[PDB]
Homo-oligomer: A and B are copies of this chain.
Amino acid sequence: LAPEDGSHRPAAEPTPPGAQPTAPGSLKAPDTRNEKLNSLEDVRKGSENYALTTNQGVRIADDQNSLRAGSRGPTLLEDFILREKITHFDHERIPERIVHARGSAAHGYFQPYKSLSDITKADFLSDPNKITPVFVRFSTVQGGAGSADTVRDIRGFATKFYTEEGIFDLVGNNTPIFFIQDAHKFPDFVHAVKPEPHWAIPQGQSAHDTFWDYVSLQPETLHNVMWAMSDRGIPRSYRTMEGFGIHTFRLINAEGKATFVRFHWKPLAGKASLVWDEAQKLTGRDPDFHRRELWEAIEAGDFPEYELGFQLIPEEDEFKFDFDLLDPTKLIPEELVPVQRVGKMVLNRNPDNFFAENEQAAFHPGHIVPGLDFTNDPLLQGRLFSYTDTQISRLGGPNFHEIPINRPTCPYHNFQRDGMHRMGIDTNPANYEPNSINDNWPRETPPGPKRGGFESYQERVEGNKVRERSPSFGEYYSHPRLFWLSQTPFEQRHIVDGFSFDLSKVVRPYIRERVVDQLAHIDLTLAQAVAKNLGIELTDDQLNITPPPDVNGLKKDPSLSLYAIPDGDVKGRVVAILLNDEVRSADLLAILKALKAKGVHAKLLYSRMGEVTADDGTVLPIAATFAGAPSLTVDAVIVPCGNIADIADNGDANYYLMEAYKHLKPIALAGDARKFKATIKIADQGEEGIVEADSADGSFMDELLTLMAAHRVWSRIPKIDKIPA
């Protein structure tokens, strides 16, 4: 059924977004390999040139019809071909994850910069030339597997390391703290954020009564709520967010020394988030935006890269801060404990089948390896129970490690047997130890510097059996305040806006008031600006609440801001080029040449599909229409010259610019395209953030690419209130 020209089928080379249909990773990049991807070969199933069969291997002659008694007669029970096909269909679905159901994943590899054997015996960190395959799943938290990507939410960032000494799963989030202190409260918190149980509304949103009810009653939540209400809660891409393990864990070296450690991922593409209006509209225009962007970046060669980093605290410093190291609502400011760079992780191939590899993957923070260990963090402690347990229903049984994506690439042998869907056929005469009948194989292995058995660090435990929160955990305001004061003025404004927007959707007014009261214990300016938007007036008492203390003398920590310290990297970003029916090919040449030199992609847009022909006869295929791929999905907009009259009174073309303008994106206007300055009210002598010139050229591209390096035009904020867009 394919067309003549082979163009049903994508080129198996890197291609920019939109240049080719997307494809399964092994067909797209068949030369991209690693030990884990190779090991999946036993279960990869091709298709070309094969006969269509039942699952039992019987060739089907007619896959268009049920078996019936006469061609208008009833379907017959003996049609086993229909019933196998429909049975398999009828049982496709499995329970989605209780939380982080929505997520997107890829393969890649990790390697350390130098050996860490002085601080850890973990084998995967032992040698700068020893590469460890990874599989990474990014996710939201609240919504179902079919909810939208660019919600306001925390994001999950889970890395499965297939090491020589075991699977290590580093199961983190994109903020450095969690909402709650003790795992016992997790069902209460998750139920409060999830859709409400009477009507199962709202999907993918904290903006509802039950969430803000819980928050207002549990001030320990305020720190992660601050991060969620900031632009952290709406990342531009999974490539442009930070990742954190949250908990303090331990590194254990060959000599037995424990060092406390917190884990960080630093996005090498820099930190970048959307703005709210854009993020919310994008949930409607492309609810798959982050899934798509990640797949397309990998297909293009813009591999997501992250630097693993460790905050390291000696054991004797456990009590030296003014917060508890074991409290997952508290961060360790980098001004106090810097992040030591550890290694680099590159994501360089997409999966073959989303369901088989992404939906069935199982990550669990208990999956550690010798050289790592846990602490008493009471959130971390209960997570260790839940991830093994939940897999029993989600993946159908205790043999979930035999599902191909989850399998260790290193040896695994033990005495466990049976369970639903058991794949492994054990030959061992023994299924117990100690045994003589197989000479006690497989055997225990004593702990040691490498290739040793797992032994827990022998932490001293002293206390009575109590259900009690540590007094050291009972402080809730000083870290929210540190985060607040570390944000730029525009970031602070967006935080105020995020709180105001969420609370406006709370139906019960006393709940809004209680949350504003909580804000008054963090920062008066923040409390008042939220109050004003809610038509609430602070009491005298509220205006007099003493600010919480600084965090160990810190008045701000700029590492907590997305933007205070520039780190922008334009490679893999995308520009909309608004075409006309007589495009000046000299502008297009200059634009594409400069974009290509910085790995910035382009999309050619028009008022219909098909082709337009430039002034020099160059035939331009049209990627999408103005309405069909809105400015939400690109980082900047260029309008080349040519026949501007063609698009000058097109409502969609004008709206495209008004939207990109509103959302603080760089805009460049060449030649007569400068006439569009009218729709967005730019001063004749110009505006910082709008690039203009008689033609698109060297200098014009430079100015545009500098603005893109800075991500958005924050100085335009005062001007966007007036535009009706």
* Residue from A55, A385, A392, A507 having most chain B Cβ neighbours under 10 A: A55
Chain B's nearest CB lies how many Å from the CB of A10? 8
Neighbouring B residues of A718 by C-beta, 8 Å = none
CB contact under 8 A between A425 and B393, given known A102-B146, A145-B146, A463-B461: no
Question: Contact: A421 with B439, CB < 8 Å?
Answer: no
CB contact under 8 A between A470 and B66, given known A85-B184, A199-B291: no
Residue of chain B at shortest CB distance from A464: B458
CB contact under 8 A between A82 and B183, given known A51-B443, A351-B198, A444-B62: yes
Neighbouring B residues of A431 by C-beta, 8 Å = 191-192, 196-197, 210
Chain B's nearest CB lies how many Å from the CB of A137? 12
Question: Contact: B52 with A414, CB < 8 Å?
Answer: yes
Check if A494 is an interface residue, CB within 8 A of chain B: no
Closest 3 CB pairs of A and B: A70-B463, A144-B146, A284-B284
Chain B's nearest CB lies how many Å from the CB of A285? 7
Known: A60-B414, A69-B465. 4 other contacts (CB 8 A): A59-B454, A60-B445, A353-B426, A437-B508
Check if A166 is an interface residue, CB within 8 A of chain B: yes
Question: Contact: A186 with B89, CB < 8 Å?
Answer: yes
Check if A58 is an interface residue, CB within 8 A of chain B: yes
Residue of chain B at shortest CB distance from A77: B75
Residue of chain B at shortest CB distance from A387: B90
Check if A61 is an interface residue, CB within 8 A of chain B: yes
* Chain A 648-669 interface residues, beta-carbon cutoff 8 Å to B: none
Check if A675 is an interface residue, CB within 8 A of chain B: no
* Residue from A80, A395, A399, A410 having most chain B Cβ neighbours under 10 A: A80
* Chain A 410-467 interface residues, beta-carbon cutoff 8 Å to B: 410-447, 451-467
User: Residue-by-residue, is A68-91 near B (CB-CB < 8 Å gives 1, otherwise 0)?
Assistant: 111111111111111111111111
Question: Contact: B417 with A468, CB < 8 Å?
Answer: no
Task: List 28 A-B residue pairs with CB atoms under 8 Å apart, sorted by A's residue number.
Answer: A3-B510, A20-B507, A22-B198, A24-B427, A45-B424, A45-B426, A45-B428, A53-B411, A59-B452, A61-B447, A62-B468, A65-B182, A66-B382, A80-B366, A80-B384, A84-B388, A86-B386, A94-B418, A191-B431, A200-B358, A210-B431, A210-B437, A217-B435, A283-B284, A284-B287, A356-B426, A456-B465, A457-B465
Q: Which of A259-267, A401-409, A679-687, A692-700 contacts B (4 or more CB under 8 A)?
A: A401-409
Check if A341 is an interface residue, CB within 8 A of chain B: no
Question: Contact: B466 with A458, CB < 8 Å?
Answer: yes
Q: A3 is contacted by which of B200, B430, B436 (Cβ under 8 Å)? A: B436
Question: Contact: A467 with B44, CB < 8 Å?
Answer: no
Q: A466 is contacted by which of B25, B67, B78, B472 (Cβ under 8 Å)? A: B67
Question: Contact: A72 with B191, CB < 8 Å?
Answer: no
* Chain A 176-210 interface residues, beta-carbon cutoff 8 Å to B: 182-192, 195-204, 209-210
* Residue from A3, A59, A101, A472 having most chain B Cβ neighbours under 10 A: A59
Check if A593 is an interface residue, CB within 8 A of chain B: no
* Chain A 95-139 interface residues, beta-carbon cutoff 8 Å to B: 95-98, 101-102
Question: Contact: B184 with A64, CB < 8 Å?
Answer: yes
Q: Which of A369-377, A549-557, A635-643 contacts B (4 or more CB under 8 A)?
A: A369-377
Question: Contact: A90 with B412, CB < 8 Å?
Answer: no
Neighbouring B residues of A462 by C-beta, 8 Å = 69-70, 73, 461-463
* Chain A 17-31 interface residues, beta-carbon cutoff 8 Å to B: 18, 20-27
Question: Contact: B98 with A95, CB < 8 Å?
Answer: no
Question: Contact: B199 with A350, CB < 8 Å?
Answer: yes
Neighbouring B residues of A147 by C-beta, 8 Å = 144, 146-147, 287
CB contact under 8 A between A93 and B95, given known A70-B464, A280-B284, A451-B59: yes
Chain B's nearest CB lies how many Å from the CB of A461? 4
CB contact under 8 A between A198 and B354, given known A73-B463, A78-B75: yes
Check if A360 is an interface residue, CB within 8 A of chain B: yes
Question: Contact: A456 with B461, CB < 8 Å?
Answer: no
Q: A199 is contacted by which of B77, B354, B458, B469 (Cβ under 8 Å)? A: B354
Neighbouring B residues of A166 by C-beta, 8 Å = 53-54, 56-59
Neighbouring B residues of A217 by C-beta, 8 Å = 1, 434-436
Check if A306 is an interface residue, CB within 8 A of chain B: no
Question: Contact: B187 with A77, CB < 8 Å?
Answer: no
User: Residue-by-residue, is A28-41 near B (CB-CB < 8 Å gives 1, otherwise 0)?
Assistant: 00000000000010
Residue of chain B at shortest CB distance from A447: B61
Neighbouring B residues of A454 by C-beta, 8 Å = 58-61, 81
Check if A338 is an interface residue, CB within 8 A of chain B: no
Chain B's nearest CB lies how many Å from the CB of A320? 15
Q: A73 is contacted by which of B69, B86, B397 (Cβ under 8 Å)? A: B69
Residue of chain B at shortest CB distance from A389: B90
CB contact under 8 A between A403 and B423, given known A93-B96, A444-B61: yes
Question: Contact: A370 with B59, CB < 8 Å?
Answer: yes
Neighbouring B residues of A146 by C-beta, 8 Å = 96, 101-102, 143-147, 203-204
Question: Contact: A417 with B78, CB < 8 Å?
Answer: no
Residue of chain B at shortest CB distance from A27: B427
Question: Contact: A187 with B85, CB < 8 Å?
Answer: yes
Question: Contact: B432 with A92, CB < 8 Å?
Answer: no
Check if A677 is an interface residue, CB within 8 A of chain B: no
Chain B's nearest CB lies how many Å from the CB of A182? 5
Question: Contact: A385 with B56, CB < 8 Å?
Answer: no
Check if A141 is an interface residue, CB within 8 A of chain B: no
Check if A672 is an interface residue, CB within 8 A of chain B: no
Neighbouring B residues of A352 by C-beta, 8 Å = 198, 425-427
Check if A355 is an interface residue, CB within 8 A of chain B: yes
Question: Contact: B426 with A52, CB < 8 Å?
Answer: no
Question: Contact: A61 with B23, CB < 8 Å?
Answer: no
Question: Contact: A355 with B200, CB < 8 Å?
Answer: yes
Q: A68 is contacted by which of B9, B48, B87, B468 (Cβ under 8 Å)? A: B468
Neighbouring B residues of A231 by C-beta, 8 Å = none
Neighbouring B residues of A46 by C-beta, 8 Å = 413, 427-428
Check if A43 is an interface residue, CB within 8 A of chain B: yes
* Chain A 141-159 interface residues, beta-carbon cutoff 8 Å to B: 143-148
Check if A546 is an interface residue, CB within 8 A of chain B: no
Q: A434 is contacted by which of B1, B23, B430 (Cβ under 8 Å)? A: B1
Check if A530 is an interface residue, CB within 8 A of chain B: no
Q: A425 is contacted by which of B44, B413, B460, B464 (Cβ under 8 Å)? A: B44
Check if A716 is an interface residue, CB within 8 A of chain B: no
